[PDB]
Amino acid sequence: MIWTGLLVGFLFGIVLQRGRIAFNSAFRDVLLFKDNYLFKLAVFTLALEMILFVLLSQVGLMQMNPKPLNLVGNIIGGFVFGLGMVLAGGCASGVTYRVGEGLTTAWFAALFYGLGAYATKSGAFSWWLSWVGQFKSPLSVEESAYYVKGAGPTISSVLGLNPWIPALVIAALFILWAFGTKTTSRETKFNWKIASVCLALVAGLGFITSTLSGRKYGLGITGGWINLFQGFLTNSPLNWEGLEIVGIILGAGVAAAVAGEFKLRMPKNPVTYLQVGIGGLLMGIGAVTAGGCNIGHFLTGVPQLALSSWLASIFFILGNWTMAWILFRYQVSKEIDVRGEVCPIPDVEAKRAVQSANDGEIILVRIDYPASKERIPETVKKLGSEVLEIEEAAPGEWNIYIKVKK
Amino acid sequence: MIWTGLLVGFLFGIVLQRGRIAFNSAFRDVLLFKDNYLFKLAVFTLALEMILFVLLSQVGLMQMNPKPLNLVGNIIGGFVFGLGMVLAGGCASGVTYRVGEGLTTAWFAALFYGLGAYATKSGAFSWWLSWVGQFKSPLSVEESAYYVKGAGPTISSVLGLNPWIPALVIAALFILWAFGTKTTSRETKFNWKIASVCLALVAGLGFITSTLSGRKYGLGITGGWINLFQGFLTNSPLNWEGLEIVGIILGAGVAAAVAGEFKLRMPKNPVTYLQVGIGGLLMGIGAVTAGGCNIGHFLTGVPQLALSSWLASIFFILGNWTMAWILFRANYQVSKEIDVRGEVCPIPDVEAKRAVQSANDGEIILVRIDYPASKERIPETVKKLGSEVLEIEEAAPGEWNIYIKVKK
Numbered sequence A: 001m002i003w004t005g006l007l008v009g010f011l012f013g014i015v016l017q018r019g020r021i022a023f024n025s026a027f028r029d030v031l032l033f034k035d036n037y038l039f040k041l042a043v044f045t046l047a048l049e050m051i052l053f054v055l056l057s058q059v060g061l062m063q064m065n066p067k068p069l070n071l072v073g074n075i076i077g078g079f080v081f082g083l084g085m086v087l088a089g090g091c092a093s094g095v096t097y098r099v100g101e102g103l104t105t106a107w108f109a110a111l112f113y114g115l116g117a118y119a120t121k122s123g124a125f126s127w128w129l130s131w132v133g134q135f136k137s138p139l140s141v142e143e144s145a146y147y148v149k150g151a152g153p154t155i156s157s158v159l160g161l162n163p164w165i166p167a168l169v170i171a172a173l174f175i176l177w178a179f180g181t182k183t184t185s186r187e188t189k190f191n192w193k194i195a196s197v198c199l200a201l202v203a204g205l206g207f208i209t210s211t212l213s214g215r216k217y218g219l220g221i222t223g224g225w226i227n228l229f230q231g232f233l234t235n236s237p238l239n240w241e242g243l244e245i246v247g248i249i250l251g252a253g254v255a256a257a258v259a260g261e262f263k264l265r266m267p268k269n270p271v272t273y274l275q276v277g278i279g280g281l282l283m284g285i286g287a288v289t290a291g292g293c294n295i296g297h298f299l300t301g302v303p304q305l306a307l308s309s310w311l312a313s314i315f316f317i318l319g320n321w322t323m324a325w326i327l328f329r330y331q332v333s334k335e336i337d338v339r340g341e342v343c344p345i346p347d348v349e350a351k352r353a354v355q356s357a358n359d360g361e362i363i364l365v366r367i368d369y370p371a372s373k374e375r376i377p378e379t380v381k382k383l384g385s386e387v388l389e390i391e392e393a394a395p396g397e398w399n400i401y402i403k404v405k406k
Numbered sequence B: 001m002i003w004t005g006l007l008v009g010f011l012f013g014i015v016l017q018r019g020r021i022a023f024n025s026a027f028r029d030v031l032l033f034k035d036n037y038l039f040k041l042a043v044f045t046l047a048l049e050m051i052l053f054v055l056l057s058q059v060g061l062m063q064m065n066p067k068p069l070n071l072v073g074n075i076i077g078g079f080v081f082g083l084g085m086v087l088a089g090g091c092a093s094g095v096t097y098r099v100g101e102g103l104t105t106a107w108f109a110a111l112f113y114g115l116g117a118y119a120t121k122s123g124a125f126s127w128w129l130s131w132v133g134q135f136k137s138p139l140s141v142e143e144s145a146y147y148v149k150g151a152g153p154t155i156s157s158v159l160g161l162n163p164w165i166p167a168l169v170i171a172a173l174f175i176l177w178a179f180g181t182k183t184t185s186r187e188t189k190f191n192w193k194i195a196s197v198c199l200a201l202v203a204g205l206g207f208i209t210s211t212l213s214g215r216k217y218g219l220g221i222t223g224g225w226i227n228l229f230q231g232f233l234t235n236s237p238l239n240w241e242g243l244e245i246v247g248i249i250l251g252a253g254v255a256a257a258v259a260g261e262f263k264l265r266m267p268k269n270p271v272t273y274l275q276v277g278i279g280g281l282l283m284g285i286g287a288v289t290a291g292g293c294n295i296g297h298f299l300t301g302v303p304q305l306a307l308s309s310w311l312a313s314i315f316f317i318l319g320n321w322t323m324a325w326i327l328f329r330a331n332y333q334v335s336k337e338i339d340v341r342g343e344v345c346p347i348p349d350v351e352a353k354r355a356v357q358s359a360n361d362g363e364i365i366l367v368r369i370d371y372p373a374s375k376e377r378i379p380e381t382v383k384k385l386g387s388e389v390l391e392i393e394e395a396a397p398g399e400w401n402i403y404i405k406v407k408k
Ligand SMILES: CCCCCCCC/C=C/CCCCCCCC(=O)OC[C@H](O)CO
Pocket: A114, A228, A229, A231, A232, A233, A235, A236, A237, A238, B112, B115, B124
């Protein structure tokens, strides 16, 4: 049973890698650049999961298990996890799958993420988690077809409604907005509509299989990394979530390689390793304090209508916003080289290069992250210019050619 | 008492950084390049430590505590630790102080070193350590002024001699060879003679203070990294050796910064991270299997005349050699420039040598480096080729331009 985590994690990783599904980017870019592509993906997926999780519970394939409510932990830990997201150059699922893509910064961030989460759970930061534990809400639900006994409060349970009703109302609202609203364009072939459907299916598969293996929950990140570290350092057995992490990495790597997008990568400046290192530590403290991360709380907990998960997600986003302001703000006439610069940067340095350019000029942009080669084309068409061709130099490296137009 | 580890480690770290004392380089370059500078440093320090450890035991400031003999562990672990050295681009002390010099590769290699050693002591590789433990030799010494009760066999104990006698004989032979033999030349101002005296003084100080904190041993590395990880991950208290590691890093960092040699650094090719990560893991498994590392066994154990330490050191060197073969088999006109910034030492020296030979008479050679050891080795490699170094200028902090005029 436990070995189904490797399979679910493998599929999870392919979807994350092919879709460029980075929630840290989704929260950040909806503030910095009014980009909602990844936010539409998130909302549509949450909507599908809302319908799927209650449907799968109805027919007896799983029970929902909302995480307990803890206002101090969910808020403070949520917020601190939001800060670390931006510093580490991605949320925990994003860091995890970028490991298999070949980014050494993500190797660094995952190490400090795992160690910091381990340390907050049972080591040098245990005292903090103990202090936060006193503020846990005693509110719980009773065993039913929908809920594991003793789980945390939901929108349904507070309202006294069958979980089907808020699930359908909220999802329909989510879908109305996702579809009745304009979305930022991207060149991703694995587009946000079909990625949402795949991601939710993988989500349901994970809740089912993980439950059979004795972990009554769907996809998560933080507990998988702690299960792996416990295994290596204490010889404890691996569990479903530990194997899911392995699967994510392996799946993202396979998917990157087959797409010719795998490449061992380094940042432009060495100090980034210090940044993503501190960032990963903040994430480990935040996630453990909060009781879950971008996946455990947001992708998996929100569609269960868990109050803890809605609350922690609000502060995931506010922390992301705080840290994002702290950190941010063929002839060939000019050449900009943004290889190894953090995923916001290539789009920003290519926008500023097209603006600070004369008409008819041909600009070369050098990138080595595939998310940017599907974002810069749209930023270019909304500036008057047009992309001539995206040519692959090395594997995992692409040259973008732009003809400026007024 | 435990806090004296930070002090001793801080001093230990300064001496390593200033002297460029990297034993992995010491073993490798004596085979690759017939370079014996760092090996005279090691041999002289060992000699000074042999006299010092016994003298300090005589007057009651410490007792020696030779590590136990284990042929399977000391040989196989020593050899595996040898392979890891070269892959990680530095031994365990070299990786540790390079963390303070700002090498992100050292950060990486330390992480996998600490985790691999922890996993070998009590995690997923403990099965191997258990299997090795069955071969432990029951040989041991009795409590005396010289020895902790139950410590492992020494040259003295096997010979039935007062520890002073093999100590003075072997050290005198070491000092004869060190001073009666030519040594490879270097530009290091903290030269191998004055560095050996300081290193041995710091070594003795560590043996004294650590013993007062309840760890009857001198300088080590692997235990401190495990003590650190245990504290962070399980909330256990830090001991003298964990604080010694912290000291080492702080010490090298201050020393590098004051010398204007500190710089956050990246390797030339990203795969180096995979390399040094695997290397650090090999070191963790090897050091724990061997019962000690370049410091715990070689620097601290050999002067105690501990059979375990002499034996494991033999295979540290054999493993280093094996891996060394697998792996290594201003206005100035400037005719050609070689940029070896971020390339792993021996490479700057190697690519600078090849560049001078593959060049025409009178050509001006610009070598770009960013590791401070290389700027004291390349000058001698150049003079033994006929050419001469015009000037070594500082480009960035931690970065140097070497200008070579090629003759004939
Ligand atoms: C296992 C061989 C390769 C190990 C490379 C470790 C490098 C350092 C990374 C640490 C965190 C993740 C470590 C995950 C390693 C697998 C988990 C493990 O050791 O499992 C033990 C098992 O559960 C007992 O029954």
